[PDB]
Design a protein around this ligand. Structure first.
Ligand SMILES: Nc1ncnc2c1ncn2[C@@H]1O[C@H](COP(=O)(O)OP(=O)(O)OP(=O)(O)O)[C@@H](O)[C@H]1O
Ligand SMILES: Nc1ncnc2c1ncn2[C@@H]1O[C@H](COP(=O)(O)OP(=O)(O)OP(=O)(O)O)[C@@H](O)[C@H]1O
Ligand SMILES: [Mg+2]
Ligand SMILES: [Mg+2]
Ligand SMILES: [Mg+2]
Ligand SMILES: [Mg+2]
Lengths: 582, 582
């Protein structure tokens, strides 16, 4: 029945998730100064103030808030009360966006798209809150992929973060990460005139295919090419997201299909689960196998999710460089921090789009793939992996995962958080100061290695797209040259201030305070302490600690929601712990 | 197998259809002055000249052409020869568009979309040329729906005319008109707060539903609402294109589904065929039933194919007005020309999009429907119906339908064409002069009534969207007020010059000449003769014949392809037959 496809859309659960998204919208938009709530007096929850939002058409939102560090608006969702001209009304996230549309500054051309992203985020939220779920306590001790597929929030700062625009109602149940439906990849023969292969210096295409597909499947694919009168030597075998084949490649790449530059070989035998990034897949049929990342022409969280052939060309070289650098560094060796290498890549160039468009465009990015190192092969017996996003997880009953994980560990909050900070933040600090090396260290890019509830180290993924060496003097292999970047002095610490402090820790301390684990100031003292101890241990780079000052009175900050909608100072929470040598 | 979905994409058929689309591109772009072919000398076909297109990157296209009336480039497809820097290359329609991209003036933002429309037009062409088809001779005598689903060309002027962007590979085989796959409508209960119903003054919702669904199905739908604790009196029942439910309504209208303002009742029992407009459906389960036209959010030929709730409100009133006008006119009564009434309509207003966007937008147009009068109920026993597009039909073997139809009729070309002109053009002339009433009279809007191969009269559809009364002094019911329009004096004859002469007859005379039925000048003499005889018979409107001069030296003309790509004089082929009274 066509109705079953949205059976998760029911009035009561819809109201629940709209209330939660209005809370996030009020909090994040206020943080970015899109909203300026008016203080009414003490709030209806102890330690909170009562705030009001008055809109020009008679809508009024009253709520409780605590303004924490970095202008962070901590709001209890049940405290929010909407009245339209004095009459109480249900919280409606889409109405809220419309009511503040003058303040948002969306182009009238882009507003309906933003609205659809909000609606789709809500529909997913309804599905996620209504599905069979593990509670916080069980999830804290679950296996890697169970944790991965059980995440609810998405990116903690972006309001319209889970749109997946392009997935129809049936696509959702087959391909959305939270649906946890096994997926088989589509395999295609691609002509070498269009497809470019790259890999690590000690790998080749044959060895990759031998590990990934196996000789039997490879043999069959080649024999199927010969059978239809083609030369296997003229082709590589390349995986695609099945949605991408049906929706994009079969149609938009029709001339290549017709000319047999692309030949559809059908579904692989092995099954995968879509990861939180949607277009990346973990193999659930066999152990030790690489993730497969694919081009997927859906709009999610600011971007179409294709994969660039130009980027693919240098991806393995960039990863090899960074891996070697990390492996040769004795501080990093002792810490355990490391990357998951994008070991091989395939880019299919569409010369029609390339001839037509000189500029950067998603149209060039519809058909690429890469293979990423499996982290389970890197850890000790008994250890387990969890997406760092899990530390922010709150289950549909309102129970936080973090205190459960800390309880399970047997350690005090302080000791646990010190271990976490030295596993996650300190290596980022070291990579910055010692190597000018920066990543994108948000919850979906960081995998924590957990030992009896305790983070013992961290893995970073999403390397070649996001990483930079901030020193044009670095000597790189030609293929890896785009890694080198040069950023103004004022913005060098962007990845720590914006991506770690504002993008992740800001949300973490709300959880810490709500669950009574730790006051925000204690957390920031601890963070400052780890930074200062690192700097003390490596005094020879004082020039850099002074020039790029983590203890500056004000921090770099970004307005992520403003940036998405488009296409003052923020005091630094560790400034008061500034060490003497600065 | 995922490969079967594009089994129609094979090298040889791909080359065939690309050659045909390059012919159309060269002809239409040249007609609009986007191209200016250089004459080399006499052509390689008798009566043709040889022309060259030189592009700045070494591509050269030589071809034979005859420049007919209205700067019409008649080109034999096999005469076209592409050389890239002296080396012969296959004709590739997408490459051709790219090669002339400087001349087209596409925004760099809109070019990739245009390219996709070209590619999808080609993929459809490949399917259409490769499918099981009737030959021209059989099609000339086939039933209405067989003719409808067997059309190949599409709009004869637009190069990128059959994109259907949004239909994936599987959607194509289920929903494209040429796939001729029976479709069942999706039925939804829609809340009266959002859904507005309109119909003819002597109809009501209950009688419409009684005729269309029947009491049994209506009863069941209402009982299903009550069963789930809703009041049937709060809802109408409304049909949708199933693609629209899965891709747009279930997701983008999620808040309404969640709030139960939209309730999916499932597929209807009756089966339909998609007409050439894609979103309009003819009932193939029962006789006498109305067409159902639906909102479908795909991009085709310049426009997203939704259906406006604002337009729906006055649609039946506009149709009732025009029908009554035609019925009261004794000239039209004697001729037989008439409209197929859009008798009832339903518009679902999405108040989120309406609150957010003040301007005209496709987002407001995603959920509407109307019902259109069935023409089979209006004709005599033994007569048959055919889309006027059929007169331009050429089968995959290169055989034209028109000479077969004329041969079947027993009449000479001249006599046959005189009957056709008096069935089609003369009533348009009368409607203009006597009533200031204009339509959009292209091949897909006109249905010919055929009697033993002879057109005896014509039906016009697509009324409320396209028609105007060009006289603000007309007294209309309030609901029908938007019918009245006021156009500058110089552009009043647009619908005849642009839509009939340039848009349809221009293509017709190529067929007439190619098939040796009639020289173009004989055709234009005949047309002029029908016009002059009409004017002679109604001398009292001479003021209007002088003011809006069908015999002016130059005609109104439009560059349709330029207009689509964006978002000199053209001599009038009947100017030399100007009657004495002008
Ligand atoms: N907690 C989270 N933090 C950040 N992004 C998240 C989170 N949960 C889900 N996501 C989604 O993951 C994607 C992150 O974007 P990013 O560019 O980092 O990854 P990617 O390049 O798409 O894939 P991968 O990380 O597999 O290489 C976005 O689609 C985002 O919406
Ligand atoms: N020979 C043809 N002439 C004009 N349009 C055609 C032809 N064949 C197919 N079409 C398609 O039919 C549609 C014509 O557009 P138009 O606005 O006249 O109709 P509509 O409002 O979509 O539907 P209907 O005519 O059913 O009311 C376009 O999608 C066009 O591509
Ligand atoms: Mg990532
Ligand atoms: Mg990335
Ligand atoms: Mg029409
Ligand atoms: Mg129309």
């Amino acid at each position: 029945h066509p109705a079953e496809i949205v059976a998760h859309l029911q009035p009561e659960i819809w109201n629940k998730v709209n209330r939660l998204l209005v809370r996030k919208a009020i909090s994040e938009y206020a943080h970015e100064w899109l909203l300026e709530p008016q203080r009414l007096g003490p709030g209806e929850t102890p330690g909170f103030e009562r705030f009001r939002l008055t809109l020009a058409d008679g809508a009024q939102y009253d709520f409780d808030a605590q303004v924490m560090a970095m202008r962070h608006w901590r709001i209890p969702p049940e405290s929010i009360v909407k009245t339209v001209a004095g009459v109480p009304a249900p919280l409606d996230a889409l109405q809220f966006v419309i009511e503040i549309r003058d303040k948002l500054g969306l182009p009238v051309d882009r507003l309906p798209i933003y609205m659809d992203e909000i609606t789709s985020t809500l529909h997913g939220s309804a599905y996620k809150h209504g599905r069979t779920t593990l509670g916080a306590a069980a999830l804290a001790r679950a296996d890697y992929q169970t944790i991965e597929t059980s995440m609810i929030e998405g990116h903690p700062s972006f309001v319209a973060n889970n749109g997946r625009l392009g997935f129809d109602a049936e696509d959702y149940h087959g391909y959305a990460p939270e649906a946890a439906t096994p997926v088989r990849l589509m395999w295609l023969a691609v002509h070498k005139d269009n497809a470019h292969f790259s890999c690590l210096s000690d790998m080749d295409y044959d060895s990759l295919m031998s590990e990934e597909l196996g000789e039997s499947a490879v043999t069959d694919f080649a024999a199927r090419l010969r059978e239809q009168g083609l030369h296997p030597a003229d082709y590589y075998f390349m995986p695609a997201h099945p949605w991408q084949w049906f929706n994009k490649l079969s149609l938009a790449f029709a001339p290549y299909v017709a000319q047999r530059k692309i030949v559809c070989l059908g579904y692989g035998e092995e099954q995968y689960l879509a990861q939180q990034s949607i277009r990346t897949f973990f193999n659930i049929s066999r152990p030790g196998k690489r993730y497969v990342k694919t081009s997927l022409s859906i709009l999610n969280m600011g971007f179409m999710r294709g994969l660039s052939p130009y980027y693919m060309a240098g991806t393995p070289a960039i990863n090899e460089y960074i891996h070697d650098l990390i492996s040769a560094d004795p501080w990093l060796r002792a810490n355990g921090f490391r990357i998951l290498r994008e070991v091989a890549s395939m880019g299919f160039r569409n010369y029609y789009y390339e001839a037509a468009i000189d500029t950067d465009t998603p149209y060039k990015k519809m058909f690429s793939a890469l293979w990423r190192e499996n982290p389970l092969t890197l850890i000790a017996p008994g250890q387990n992996l969890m997406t760092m996003a899990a530390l922010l997880h709150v289950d549909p009953q309102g129970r936080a995962l973090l205190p459960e994980l800390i309880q399970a560990s047997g350690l005090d909050a302080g000791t646990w958080l010190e271990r976490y900070v030295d596993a996650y933040l300190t290596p980022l600090i070291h990579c910055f100061y010692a190597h000018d090396l920066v990543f994108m260290p948000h919850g979906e890019n960081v995998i924590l290695v957990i030992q009896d509830g305790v983070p013992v180290r961290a893995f970073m993924k999403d390397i070649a797209e996001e990483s930079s060496i901030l020193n044009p003097q670095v000597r790189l292999p030609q293929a890896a040259q785009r890694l080198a970047a040069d950023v103004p002095e004022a913005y060098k610490l962007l990845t720590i201030f914006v991506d770690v402090f504002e993008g992740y820790f800001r949300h973490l301390t709300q959880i810490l305070v709500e669950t009574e684990l730790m006051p925000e100031h204690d957390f920031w003292r601890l963070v400052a302490g780890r930074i200062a101890a690192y700097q003390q241990a490596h005094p020879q780079r004082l020039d850099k600690y002074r020039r790029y000052d983590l203890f500056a009175p004000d921090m770099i900050h970004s307005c992520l929601n403003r940036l998405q909608l488009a296409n003052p100072n923020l005091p630094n929470p560790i400034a008061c712990f500034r060490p003497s040598w600065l």
